[PDB]
Symmetry: D2
């Protein structure tokens, strides 16, 4: 099965994930 997903929603989610990915190192150190 395939689901249509808005490209801009995946891009916004990617940005949010990237933001957490770059924030956690600061917390860990």
């Amino acid at each position: 099965e395939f689901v249509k997903v808005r490209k801009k929603d995946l891009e916004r989610l990617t940005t949010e994930v990237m933001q957490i990915r770059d924030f956690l190192p600061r917390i860990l150190n």
Copy 2:
């Protein structure tokens, strides 16, 4: 614009997001 995503990939993504979500009590409880 829409991207055609495999339902199994969205199911994996959902599960990964839920695992992060359900880490919050452990992180916040001290």
Copy 3:
């Protein structure tokens, strides 16, 4: 081992996690 984290950083982290969590309906609804 424990890391001393600023409460404001955990609050930011929590909010970031919740934003990702609350994206799931939009991603899954088609």
Copy 4:
């Protein structure tokens, strides 16, 4: 205020975040 957080919990969360960060590009393309 400071909160004590288990280092291994932040490391596990980092791993989970990194896994999503590397998975979303595959979905987006």
